[PDB]
Structure 1
Amino acid sequence: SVVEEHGQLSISNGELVNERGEQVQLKGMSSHGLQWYGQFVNYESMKWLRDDWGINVFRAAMYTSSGGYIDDPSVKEKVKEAVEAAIDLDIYVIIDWHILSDNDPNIYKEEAKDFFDEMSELYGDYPNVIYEIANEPNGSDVTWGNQIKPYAEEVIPIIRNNDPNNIIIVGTGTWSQDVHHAADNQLADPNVMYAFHFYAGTHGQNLRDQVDYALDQGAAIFVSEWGTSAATGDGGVFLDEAQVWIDFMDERNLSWANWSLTHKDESSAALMPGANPTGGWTEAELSPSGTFVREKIRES
């Protein structure tokens, strides 16, 4: 129903819109690393998230390093499983080239080009797909102008040769927080968005103001990852600040995916240890984070 109703997504005047030019907001879940917790990514679990939580997007977090795709490329097949499930379930899907320790996206740019060529050739005639080409550029030696933007200007043409206008999300500096610099030096492609990531354990008032600055430059922003925890993915749950961010994102038409769908013993994880990897969770099988996130999506 979601993808049939909204169809082809695009950017108009800095906003995500549907094929009738109306604003749309996506809200959903990210997987954890597919090399560690891929059992939670399947048609049945995604269907349960769609029907019981109300998700309309799912993010497939394919780590490049840390045992991910560069080390063992078989994980790309789990991305394909996720995309095919989203197509069958009529929801949107984010294909996330999940850089982190490999902090400069140029480190694995050759492999990224080949991966996004393959994915856009396979899936480029479906409206479901959103390409996230570099999760979290980071380090003082990785800047928008010097590293990230030129990386994007090599990968985006590869995608566009197969898929002329599905959305592309481009990571920003400082773990996808530096939307100010991106917004002052935007890419040419009209269907690009810049990633912004937050964790509720960080006091967020200036970060909200920086998102507003970026929006005021006409840049589109997708909150492609956020958590209720501290910035480590652990360290407690911060639901007061999470709610402030939820309300901010609703006021600003910002789409989002929450980190993450796993039973790992960390506060950002949505599930508790006994949760079935094919869905059907009871209240007791959701963590405090998962309960909150489910409520936010159901309220929506």
Structure 2
Amino acid sequence: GTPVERYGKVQVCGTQLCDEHGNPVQLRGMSTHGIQWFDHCLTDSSLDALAYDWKADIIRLSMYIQEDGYETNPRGFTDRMHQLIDMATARGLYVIVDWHILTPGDPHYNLDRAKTFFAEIAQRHASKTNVLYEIANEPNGVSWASIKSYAEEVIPVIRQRDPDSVIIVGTRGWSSLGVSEGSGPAEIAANPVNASNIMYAFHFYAASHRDNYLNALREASELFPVFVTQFGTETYTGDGANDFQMADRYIDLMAERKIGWTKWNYSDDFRSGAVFQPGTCASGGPWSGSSLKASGQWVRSKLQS
């Protein structure tokens, strides 16, 4: 069966994401790049490849708000997101709907838009069991208390329409569980979001983020559910040399704790983190072999087990 057929209606149980019968499950997959730039990478052909060939469990649909994203055409972006959610569902994939804030880094900057967007998405897709909602990608320059209060404003909008869906909440310092801004996950544990069926996001780039970030991820997974919605094997820019030795340490920890992940990213951007070589999406593939960057061959190999 497909991932969705095998695990069904996933929910948080204790400090882990579980399938519909209480067994902890690790969902591993890929994140798209921003759809305002790399929409041409997301076709019947590339998505079929991700599902049937790469054996991904999950796809994260990254919708930037600024940077020529959602704010420029709310109707058009929303319609394309409905289409992509349906396409992922038709290939048996779990889907993360990613409200991809970055700059400005205060999520409240985009709150009014977020409520509109998520109200539409949650009403339309309420009957689906395979959609997770990520309400704020990479909060930065803000306190944990302000992220918590943002989450408590948006969560009821979703839950009013779709009460059983899992929501992922971004964390301080570009979702580094506070590490980049001189803090850590203990801050979250002491003042958690007042809702359940919640997970907290962690992002890392293995060439830049070493033992202190790895230790923070281990600490956080003792206290609350974590999903790695964005990670790379290169530096924090999404480019540069890969450190696969460090990446493998993260992969092993995540497998051991059943922490799900989506790798940045499923596009043919020039940066080393984008899994395809430039020109691949314009050529219509192939989505394996000589079209893969080093990071691409590495992740595809992890996903195929």
TM-score, normalised by the number of residues in structure 1: 0.95
How far, CA to CA, are the matches of 2:109 and 2:67 in structure 1?
A: 14
From 195, 217, 223, the equivalent of 2:201 is 195
8 Å contact kept, 1:230–1:236: yes
From 116, 119, 126, the equivalent of 2:118 is 116
- 2:38 is the counterpart of 1:33: no
1:123-161 Cα distance to aligned partner (Å, 9 max, x none): 11101100000000011xx0111x110110010000000
Per the alignment, residue 205 of structure 1 pairs with 211
From 124, 137, 153, the equivalent of 1:135 is 137
8 Å contact kept, 2:46–2:287: no
- Letter aligned with residue 144 of structure 1: W
Per the alignment, residue 144 of structure 1 pairs with 144
How far, CA to CA, are the matches of 1:133 and 1:197 in structure 2?
A: 15
Q: Where do 1:95-244 residues align within 5 Å? A: 95-139=97-141, 142-145=142-145, 147-178=146-177, 179-217=185-223, 219-244=224-249
- Letter aligned with residue 40 of structure 1: C
Give the CA deviation at 1:24: 0.7
Q: Which has the higher helix share?
A: 2
How far, CA to CA, are the matches of 1:265 and 1:171 in structure 2?
A: 27
How far, CA to CA, are the matches of 2:187 and 2:79 in structure 1?
A: 35
Per the alignment, residue 181 of structure 2 pairs with none
Can you give the 5+ residue segments of structure 2 that lack an aligned partner in the other structure? 178-184
- Describe the SS at the equivalent of 2:71: coil
Give the CA deviation at 1:165: 1.5
Give the CA deviation at 1:274: 3.3
How far, CA to CA, are the matches of 2:41 and 2:236 in structure 1?
A: 23
8 Å contact kept, 1:103–1:136: yes
Give the CA deviation at 1:201: 1.3
Runs of 4+ in structure 1 off by over 3 angstroms are: 276-280
- Describe the SS at the equivalent of 2:168: strand
- 2:13 is the counterpart of 1:15: no
8 Å contact kept, 1:30–1:259: yes
How far, CA to CA, are the matches of 2:188 and 2:48 in structure 1?
A: 35
- Describe the SS at the equivalent of 1:190: coil
Aligned-pair identity in percent equals: 40
8 Å contact kept, 2:51–2:92: no
From 281, 284, 287, the equivalent of 1:281 is 287
How far, CA to CA, are the matches of 2:288 and 2:303 in structure 1?
A: 16
Can you give the 5+ residue segments of structure 1 that lack an aligned partner in the other structure? none
Give the CA deviation at 1:203: 3.8
How many residues are paired up? 295
What RMSD, in angstroms, separates the aligned Cα atoms of the two structures?
Answer: 1.3
Per the alignment, residue 54 of structure 2 pairs with 53
TM-score, normalised by the number of residues in structure 2: 0.93
How far, CA to CA, are the matches of 1:174 and 1:238 in structure 2?
A: 22
Per the alignment, residue 271 of structure 1 pairs with 276
How far, CA to CA, are the matches of 1:101 and 1:17 in structure 2?
A: 33
1:171-220 Cα distance to aligned partner (Å, 9 max, x none): 00100012332232111222000000000112421212212222222x10
- Letter aligned with residue 202 of structure 1: S
Per the alignment, residue 86 of structure 2 pairs with 84
1:267-298 Cα distance to aligned partner (Å, 9 max, x none): 11100023246554241101111111101111
From 285, 294, 302, the equivalent of 1:296 is 302
8 Å contact kept, 2:268–2:278: yes
8 Å contact kept, 1:229–1:238: yes
Give the CA deviation at 1:43: 3.2
